[PDB]
Design a binder for this molecule. Sequence first.
Ligand SMILES: [Mg+2]
Ligand SMILES: [Mg+2]
Lengths: 49, 119, 241, 57
Amino acid sequence: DPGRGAPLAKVVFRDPYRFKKRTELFIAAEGIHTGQFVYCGKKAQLNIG
Amino acid sequence: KKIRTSPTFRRPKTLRLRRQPKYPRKSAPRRNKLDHYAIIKFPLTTESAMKKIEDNNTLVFIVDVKANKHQIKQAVKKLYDIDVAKVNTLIRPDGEKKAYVRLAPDYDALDVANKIGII
Amino acid sequence: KVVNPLFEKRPKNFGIGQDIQPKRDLTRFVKWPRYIRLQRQRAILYKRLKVPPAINQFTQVLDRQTATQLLKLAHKYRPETKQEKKQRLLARAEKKAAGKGDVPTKRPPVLRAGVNTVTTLVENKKAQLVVIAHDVDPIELVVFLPALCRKMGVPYCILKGKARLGRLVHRKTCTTVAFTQVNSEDKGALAKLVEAIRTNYNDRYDEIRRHWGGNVLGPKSVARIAKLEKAKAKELATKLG
Amino acid sequence: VRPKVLMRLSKTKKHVSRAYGGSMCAKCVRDRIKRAFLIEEQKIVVKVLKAQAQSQK
RNA sequence: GGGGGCGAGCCCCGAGGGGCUCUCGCUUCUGGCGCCAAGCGCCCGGCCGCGCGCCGGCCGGGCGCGACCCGCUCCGGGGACA
RNA sequence: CGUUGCCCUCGGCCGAUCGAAAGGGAGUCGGGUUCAGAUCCCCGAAUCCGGAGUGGCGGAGAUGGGCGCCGCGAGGCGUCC
Ligand SMILES: [Mg+2]
Ligand SMILES: [Mg+2]
């Protein structure tokens, strides 16, 4: 991302109400790679990204 | 017992009626002022035009600037009981719309020219 | 057999991150237009805020059985509609020069309608009973009225519906209503009604004056407090006792 | 060819005779297939292991 | 608030079960798929066959559960101070 | 069969609008022709887009296979998918 030191990550979820694949721009935590799964929420596991 | 599936509340589509005006605003419709006559002002009899007539099977007109090629085509047809292949307008640096009118091959341009007056 | 082998089940697990959720009812979470949202949370303030007693008294409305008696009795004394008015005049015009015209005959009793008529005939002790609508829109119109009636000793009640009160007369709504007189046949029923009403309103006006009444919390707030009280209760009740 | 041309072109020129024809490469289809299959099998295995654990308890 | 129950803590228990408390609302090995309902249940219109037709078949629909009930602020965070 | 009126049914968007003769943006080229115009006029070759209803025509969809008869055989009919 221009004018930003960090890299971003296009992360694709599935909208859980309409059949539709939403997408997000997270700030990339170091150690992220493509074709990784990113879990998120209260019952998310404590690993990176 | 008719549930909201979605959290939006868009406006409800109501009936809306046609006009049924109790009186017409303008008394009578405006008579057209771009008739078969007003559209075609006069023919050019210029050296260039006459050469265009004899050789290319056309007629050259000055036309009213508001005219479409479609209107000119219909006009010429009406006035000179003719039939047109294609109309090909330009606007003179002057303000008069010129229209070269290619007459269909069945008809001659020289004959119609003599009919209308120019030669 | 009448049971085809192919017909399966295929059940949808509406878990989390599983098969996309069903279209369940969301009326609770709708983003409502500002008018709706306003009119809804106006009623919430009237619950939540400390409402003073002269406005509160309009919550204490008349009960169902009594109300249907009252409206039955008024049905006798519904004031003349249009057309009826013309026929009353037309018949009198015909009778003047035909077969003896007296002029005044004898006019029957009827309801009296809006606050200003009513207040002039509560001041003057002409009314026997006063029916007041609970839901007059700028309350001020009818606030003093119940205090006034009790001062002049006029039985008064608060019916539901300024509309259904206004449907006695033939208009959209009415604030008030009053019986000045009633026919001898229906006099005893009115008298029965009157006593039942005054026991419930006039003859306990001191209690109505004292009785403030909003200051209720949201159920979501209340429930939290009760849970906190149950924590405080179980902290010092099961331990000792 | 420039996208607005595709309009003119015949279907056969625009795609290829396969599942995910002309949208996705052959390599990544045949992986998808066997991924989809090998994933589903393990779900079935986990479902069986769950059912055995329910029967045990 | 109840249902549901695989289960765990507690209480009761007649070992069948019940109640309170937790727990979930059930998805973590892979760069897949995933909507517009199956399933059950109750109704009706027409047509046909048994003829007693909410009996059976053929064709076509509707509602309920599936997808608990009730509620007063959409959810959070502040807040009588900003 | 259209056209419209009503009833049900479905529908996220995302901001009305303006903003490029050098950004994006389907499709035209050769020869001839004028005192001055030509990818624009004439000749000749093309081409895109929109329409094409009643569908203007072919071709594709599609014309198998079974069984049963009759026929010397090519085959014809009956009936099943
Ligand atoms: Mg190809
Ligand atoms: Mg523009």
